[PDB]
Amino acid sequence: GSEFRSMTAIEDILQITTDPSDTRGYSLLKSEEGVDFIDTLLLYQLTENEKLDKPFEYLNDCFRRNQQQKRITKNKPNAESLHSTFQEIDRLVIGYGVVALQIENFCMNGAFINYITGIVSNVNSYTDFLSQIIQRAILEGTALDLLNAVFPTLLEYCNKHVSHFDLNESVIYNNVLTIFELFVTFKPIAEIFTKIDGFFADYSCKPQDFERKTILGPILSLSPIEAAVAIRNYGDNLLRSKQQTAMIHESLQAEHKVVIDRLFFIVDKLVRGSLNSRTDMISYFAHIANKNHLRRADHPPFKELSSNGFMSNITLLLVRFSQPFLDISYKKIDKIDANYFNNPSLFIDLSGETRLNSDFKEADAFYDKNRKTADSKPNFISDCFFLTLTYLHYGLGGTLSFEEKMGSEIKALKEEIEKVKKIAANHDVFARFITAQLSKMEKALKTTESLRFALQGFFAHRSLQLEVFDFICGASTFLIRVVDPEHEFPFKQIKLPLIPDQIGVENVDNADFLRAHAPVPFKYYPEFVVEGPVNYSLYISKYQTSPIFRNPRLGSFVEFTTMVLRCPELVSNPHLKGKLVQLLSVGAMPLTDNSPGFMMDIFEHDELVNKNLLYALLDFYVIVEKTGSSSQFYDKFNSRYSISIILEELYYKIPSYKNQLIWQSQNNADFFVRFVARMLNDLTFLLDEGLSNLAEVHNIQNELDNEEDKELQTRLASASRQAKSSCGLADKSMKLFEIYSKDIPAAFVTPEIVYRLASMLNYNLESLVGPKCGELKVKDPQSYSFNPKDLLKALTTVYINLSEQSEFISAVAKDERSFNRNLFVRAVDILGRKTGLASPEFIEKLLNFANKAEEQRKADEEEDLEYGDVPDEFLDPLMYTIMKDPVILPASKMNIDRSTIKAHLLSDSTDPFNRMPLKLEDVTPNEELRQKILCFKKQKKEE
């Protein structure tokens, strides 16, 4: 007999008795008065006992005492006699704990919110009981009811019971994450999680509320780039040292790392739950994306879009889900469906999305032609990969464009508060109005300056950024496989060009042709597939801890870039390719020590790169000419500036390319001559538009003596940006002519180049040597890439590098328009003032050339008025005989004797002058010219 040890246990654990004379402060009931009495004491303590304002905390404390009273007893004899009770306590306590989180108004005090509030504040002390409650709910098949009572409620706690649910509230967000982990770890729960009320957004939910009104909202927003977290961590003292600033960057990164790890774990469990769950997971993220495209606008409506912290976290998550399939072995590389866009999109809203090389019509058409294939096919692995590309662009892309602009925002803001800080407000009302205004501005300035530090801390976070770029590289490999006609890459090299090089790009907008011959599925992929990677790559390149620098997978993206820059059919958009070519220029620039750019090794040893890089650059340098957009008609000059930086470096550091160039000019002169023609044409005006602009910059600073002060900015600034771009391209163009004319002099004196070259050179020489450059007054000439001395030295060097080609000295001499010996005399004068020129031997060579030039001119003058009586227009171009039946060639517009072309068309049916196919039928007679000759032969009958 010892059942007294029971009722005494039932009371010390449930903390309740019936007698008023109890020593310890236990609740007391005045109803009736062992084991078969527990359900009664409990039911009472939860529904009729007013002193228990915190019911769930009670049931939890009871359960915990019973577990303590359990481990304490067994280690003794009387043990066996209690087991019966502990058992029934557990069975009912967890049973009501389940009910407390399923039926709303079941207890006499509080509701769901009050209970989970208690749980969040001290999650650890609730863990065990919660575990039991969950198991109980699934064994009974009522887990969803459990979840609809805890997570939708938790959403209310994060939005209403906390000022801000962000990284600041350390204790609170960690506990919330824990109650999330504890739950999703049970698969029976994970496979049902997305069915919870509020997991999806209401149709009328605004994008900025996705992170507030959706179940995964709050925790997915946990990031160091939330304004409140930035102000708190950096706005604190924006004047601290880079050393101290680096410490908080470290703290925030360490903390952010953990956050995405736990977030990944939670989403991973929901994706592994079932096929239904991961599918809803794709629907969930697709919606977040489809409604945030404006995050990529020029002036984004921030208050109507999701935050950078949210979108960026999701981009990171997606990236890890995709990482496995893009590992360096690419063994699972085919799990990703290349025909993903062959049918109407099921998740990612592609309307309005520009394709690589195609329009809507063709896309829809592609959809009809493919309805023959499975209509349904929501393949998760592919969805996730392409969703990652979507977030890379709209999520991260909008976050990086956001901080890329803060510099100008801060500068302009500082000028606004300084302008307002001058106002003298006499009236008290006006004074408050002005101070209020200064208050709003400085309040925004602090947010911006703090957020900028926060954003830089995030992008300098190599660990994370590395994951992002390695995905770009894996994405690259994947895209090259789509393009490769045998879809074998990287297991079998890819063959470039795809379609043979159009010997004569001299066709009517290849647009239609190229598009028609664009790669099968690739031509339909949305443009953000390439723009995302390149916007990102160009952007993080400014950080010292860049993912791109010294990364072993860089080659993949370089290979992809080269492929695009090589086959004009792949991506039509010239603007997009200019970006790529700009990334390459970044990877080609030397350093302080003057060692190879970080991409040079790849350019030299990557097979797919060194086999096409040079030709791609030379070809793209030319194609950007067929561009004409709104504020993008000046990017073809930036593309050329960039292509030029690369050309120069490749030529100095990699003999392999120096040889590819040389070879090119001899084995494919047509292509090579086509490239220097464009460099030549542009060079006839570059220095001129540089001088015109610097002229406008000096006018404006003059008008500033005290028109509309504002417009004189978007103006003056704009003139400087044209001056720097013009003088800069000119400089790189001369260098290239100089750099090449030294090794392949012959290539530049071919008839299609020599006369135009001599003219262009002489024109610039006149400019440099005279009043056009001499009269120009400027601020920091260098700030605009304007070095008239460097230019004059490189120009003069070109002459010297070509001063042994009779054709060139003849061309320079025959240049009526600009040639004049005194120009070289002046040049020799300028170069002989400041120490800068391989002279006086150099000056020796130039002056020599100038002399041969003047001699060649005097001879030509003598030859003309002494040995040429018959006016040149009457002489046949090829026989030099006086024409009897002059006719006009349709293509060349040249006049030639009928007898001559006939003789030519016999073994060659083409225009002797430009090889344009010609037939004798389309030759138009020139009667007016023939009569002038008949008239000449007539008067010539003197004797």
The pattern of x and - marking residues 179 through 218 that bind K ion according to CB under 5 A reads ----------------------------------------
Query: Which one, 217 or 568, has the nearer CB to K ion?
Result: 217
* CB of 145 vs K ion, minimal distance in Å: 28
- Asked whether position 308 contacts K ion by CB under 5 A, the answer is no
Residue sitting closest to K ion (CB): 221
Q: Which of 45, 66, 194, 221 binds K ion (CB under 5 A)?
A: 221
Query: Which one, 163 or 329, has the nearer CB to K ion?
Result: 163
Give residue 886's identity as a one-letter amino acid code: P
* CB of 106 vs K ion, minimal distance in Å: 31
Query: Which one, 166 or 383, has the nearer CB to K ion?
Result: 166
Query: What does the block give as tokens for 507?
Result: 């066709």
DSSP string, 780-799: -GGGGT--HHHHHHHHHHHH
For helices 428-459 and 406-420, the axis angle rounded to 10 degrees is 160
* CB of 157 vs K ion, minimal distance in Å: 13
Query: Which one, 165 or 321, has the nearer CB to K ion?
Result: 165
Query: Which one, 142 or 159, has the nearer CB to K ion?
Result: 159
Query: Which one, 285 or 366, has the nearer CB to K ion?
Result: 285
Strands 16-17 and 895-897: unpaired
Please, are residues 314 and 391 in contact by the beta-carbon 8 Å criterion? yes
* CB of 255 vs K ion, minimal distance in Å: 15
How far is Cα 559 from Cα 493, in angstroms, rounded to an integer? 11
Task: Give the CA distances from residue 99 to residues 124, 659, 886, in Å, rounded to whole numbers and listed in that order.
Answer: 21, 81, 108
Query: Which one, 169 or 649, has the nearer CB to K ion?
Result: 169
Query: Which one, 221 or 313, has the nearer CB to K ion?
Result: 221
Q: Considering only the stretches 165-173, 312-320, 662-670, 858-866, report the one whose residues sit in contact with K ion under the rule CB under 5 A.
A: 165-173
Task: Give the CA distances from residue 498 to residues 159, 169, 495, 620, 719, in Å, rounded to whole numbers and listed in that order.
Answer: 56, 57, 7, 16, 42
Please, are residues 152 and 199 in contact by the beta-carbon 8 Å criterion? no
Query: Which one, 10 or 222, has the nearer CB to K ion?
Result: 222
- Asked whether position 223 contacts K ion by CB under 5 A, the answer is no
Burial of 31 (C-beta count, 10 Å sphere; 0-12/13-18/19+)? exposed
Going by C-alpha positions, the residue among 596, 611, 607 that lies closest to residue 648 is: 596
* CB of 209 vs K ion, minimal distance in Å: 11
How far is Cα 145 from Cα 380, in angstroms, rounded to an integer? 28
Task: Give the CA distances from residue 228 to residues 242, 314, 866, in Å, rounded to whole numbers and listed in that order.
Answer: 21, 20, 90
* CB of 228 vs K ion, minimal distance in Å: 8
Longest dimension (CA), the chain: 163
Q: Considering only the stretches 220-228, 381-389, 484-492, 621-629, report the one whose residues sit in contact with K ion under the rule CB under 5 A.
A: 220-228
Query: Which one, 214 or 477, has the nearer CB to K ion?
Result: 214
Query: Which one, 213 or 335, has the nearer CB to K ion?
Result: 213
* CB of 222 vs K ion, minimal distance in Å: 7
Q: Considering only the stretches 161-169, 501-509, 710-718, 875-883, report the one whose residues sit in contact with K ion under the rule CB under 5 A.
A: 161-169
- Asked whether position 60 contacts K ion by CB under 5 A, the answer is no
How far is Cα 97 from Cα 131, in angstroms, rounded to an integer? 11
Q: 836-841: long-range contacts at Cβ-Cβ below 8 A with a sequence spacing of 24 or more?
A: 836/789, 836/793, 837/793
Q: Which residues of 44-56 are buried (b: 16+ CB within 10 A; e: fewer)?
A: bbbeebeebebbb
* CB of 294 vs K ion, minimal distance in Å: 20
Task: Give the CA distances from residue 452 to residues 228, 395, 448, 932, in Å, rounded to whole numbers and listed in that order.
Answer: 13, 17, 6, 78
* CB of 406 vs K ion, minimal distance in Å: 21
Burial of 268 (C-beta count, 10 Å sphere; 0-12/13-18/19+)? middle
Q: Considering only the stretches 160-168, 681-689, 704-712, 794-802, report the one whose residues sit in contact with K ion under the rule CB under 5 A.
A: 160-168
The pattern of x and - marking residues 112 through 151 that bind K ion according to CB under 5 A reads ----------------------------------------
What residues does 27 pair with on adjacent strands?
16
Query: Which one, 165 or 524, has the nearer CB to K ion?
Result: 165
Query: Which one, 157 or 165, has the nearer CB to K ion?
Result: 165
Query: Which one, 212 or 335, has the nearer CB to K ion?
Result: 212
* CB of 233 vs K ion, minimal distance in Å: 15
Kindly state the number of chain residues that form the binding site for K ion, as judged by CB under 5 A.
3
Strands 16-17 and 27-28: parallel
Query: Which one, 165 or 641, has the nearer CB to K ion?
Result: 165
Query: Which one, 221 or 797, has the nearer CB to K ion?
Result: 221
Q: Considering only the stretches 19-27, 164-172, 261-269, 649-657, report the one whose residues sit in contact with K ion under the rule CB under 5 A.
A: 164-172
What residues does 17 pair with on adjacent strands?
28
* CB of 259 vs K ion, minimal distance in Å: 12
* CB of 263 vs K ion, minimal distance in Å: 13
* CB of 410 vs K ion, minimal distance in Å: 25
Please, are residues 529 and 356 in contact by the beta-carbon 8 Å criterion? yes
- The number of beta carbons lying within 10 Å of the beta carbon of residue 297 is 11
DSSP SS3 for 557: helix
How far is Cα 208 from Cα 304, in angstroms, rounded to an integer? 5
* CB of 221 vs K ion, minimal distance in Å: 4
DSSP string, 254-279: HHHHHHHHHHHHHHHHHHHH-HHHHH
The pattern of x and - marking residues 873 through 892 that bind K ion according to CB under 5 A reads --------------------
Break the chain down into helix, strand, coil percent, rounded to 5. Answer: 65, 0, 35
- Asked whether position 310 contacts K ion by CB under 5 A, the answer is no
* CB of 211 vs K ion, minimal distance in Å: 6
Query: Which one, 115 or 165, has the nearer CB to K ion?
Result: 165
* CB of 262 vs K ion, minimal distance in Å: 16
The pattern of x and - marking residues 444 through 483 that bind K ion according to CB under 5 A reads ----------------------------------------
How far is Cα 773 from Cα 239, in angstroms, rounded to an integer? 44
* CB of 249 vs K ion, minimal distance in Å: 21
Q: Considering only the stretches 105-113, 221-229, 312-320, 542-550, report the one whose residues sit in contact with K ion under the rule CB under 5 A.
A: 221-229
Task: Give the CA distances from residue 458 to residues 235, 627, 768, in Å, rounded to whole numbers and listed in that order.
Answer: 16, 37, 48
Q: Considering only the stretches 27-35, 163-171, 272-280, 580-588, report the one whose residues sit in contact with K ion under the rule CB under 5 A.
A: 163-171
Q: Considering only the stretches 118-126, 157-165, 243-251, 588-596, report the one whose residues sit in contact with K ion under the rule CB under 5 A.
A: 157-165
How far is Cα 818 from Cα 795, in angstroms, rounded to an integer? 15
- Asked whether position 165 contacts K ion by CB under 5 A, the answer is yes
Q: Provide the binding-site residues for K ion, judged by CB under 5 A.
A: 165-166, 221
